Amino acid sequence: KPFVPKLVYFEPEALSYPLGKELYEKFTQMGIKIRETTSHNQVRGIPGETELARYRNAKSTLVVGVRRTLKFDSSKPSAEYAIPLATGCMGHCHYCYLQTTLGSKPYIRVYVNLDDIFAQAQKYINERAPEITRFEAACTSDIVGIDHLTHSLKKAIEFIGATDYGRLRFVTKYEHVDHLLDARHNGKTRFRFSINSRYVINHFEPGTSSFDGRLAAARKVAGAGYKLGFVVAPIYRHEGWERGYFELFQELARQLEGMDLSDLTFELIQHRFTKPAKRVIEQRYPKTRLDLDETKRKYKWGRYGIGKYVYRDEEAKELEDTMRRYIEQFFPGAYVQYFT
């Protein structure tokens, strides 16, 4: 509030780049504990005698390295590609799908070689032109919540803004967006916020900004000319979810009244979890009310990795149909991009 790490690791090669040099100067000036690491994917000595201790301390650790995997992963249905600017998050959302993602790390990572990253992004744009290529920047992190430290997202926003056939988008649970308001986005960036019922936010989303904070930031970015959108996720069938989500869209409409919502977008994602979710989540959040009963769910099999549990077809349709009714009631002319 806003996030500042208690421990910072640096790859030695990171210091050769402008951002790495700038961060090293910043954190040494702040007197924060700094260590060295050979690879950002192999960080040693994070404090903690228990797994819970190491996990929580990792969430307060920043790692500064060089992106060496310049192949961009797909990020459908959100966008064509995931632009790799950062990985990990300081939040403690109980359901966070990044916890059980293959090769995920609990600590926060930022990449310094932005020239290489944007150059590769331009290559992908060139390969598909004159078709539009969309980039997701918050696929494996909360890029916005981290950005006050680096301004990497601001540079990405202004890079994409200068292109002809490139578009950027990202979604956040944080309100610390003041530095991005004067960015030359040029109408080519979709600034989104994750929203949910009061039940889900209060019980499952600690370490994030409040709903009022997210909406205050939503008004700022909209007022600064960004395309605005919302991601209703995870859509979770808690006790009283029907009324819970009704009141979400009602309150959302009240907090956005007066604004032009002609180009407003919605994305709907039902709660999913993997087979290793139960063991990991209960270890890290032992007092959680999160229901991970797999016998009530439908399993979707993985392609190259493992799959995940989602709600049964009839429950899923019921969620989709109900959410679509509320959006049409409170936001007519807003576009629902997908339900998954």
> Residue positions in the annotated binding site for [4Fe-4S] cluster?
89, 93, 96
Of 20, 84, 91, 106, which lies in the binding site for ligand SF4, with binding defined by CB under 6 A?
91
Instruction: Give the relative orientation of helices 313-330 and 241-255 as an angle to the nearest 10 degrees.
Output: 30
For residue 339, the partner it binds in ligand EEM, ligand SF4, none, with Cβ less than 5 to 8 A by kind, is none
Of 165 and 338, nearer to ligand EEM (C-beta) is 338
CB-CB neighbours of 72 under 10 Å? 20
Of 28 and 210, nearer to ligand SF4 (C-beta) is 210
For residue 229, the partner it binds in ligand EEM, ligand SF4, none, with Cβ less than 5 to 8 A by kind, is none
Of 64 and 268, nearer to ligand EEM (C-beta) is 268
- Contacts to ligand EEM from residues 102-161, by CB under 6 A: 138, 142
Q: Which residues contact 156 (CB under 8 A, 6 or more apart)?
A: 83, 85, 114, 118, 135, 137, 168
| Residue 142 in the binding site for ligand SF4 (CB under 6 A) | yes
| Residue 11 in the binding site for ligand SF4 (CB under 6 A) | no
| Residue 273 in the binding site for ligand EEM (CB under 6 A) | yes
| Residue 290 in the binding site for ligand SF4 (CB under 6 A) | no
| Residue 234 in the binding site for ligand EEM (CB under 6 A) | yes
Residue 256 structure tokens: 């956005």
* Whole-number Å distance between alpha carbons of 130 and 163: 11
**Is 269 in a helix, a strand, or coil?**
strand
Of 89 and 235, nearer to ligand SF4 (C-beta) is 89
| Residue 237 in the binding site for ligand EEM (CB under 6 A) | no
Q: Which residues contact 76 (CB under 8 A, 6 or more apart)?
A: none
Q: In what order do the strands lie in the sheet with 108-111?
A: 33-36, 7-10, 61-65, 108-111, 86-87
Q: Are 273 and 282 in contact (CB under 8 A)?
A: no
Report which residue type is found at 146. I
| Residue 93 in the binding site for ligand SF4 (CB under 6 A) | yes
| Residue 272 in the binding site for ligand EEM (CB under 6 A) | yes
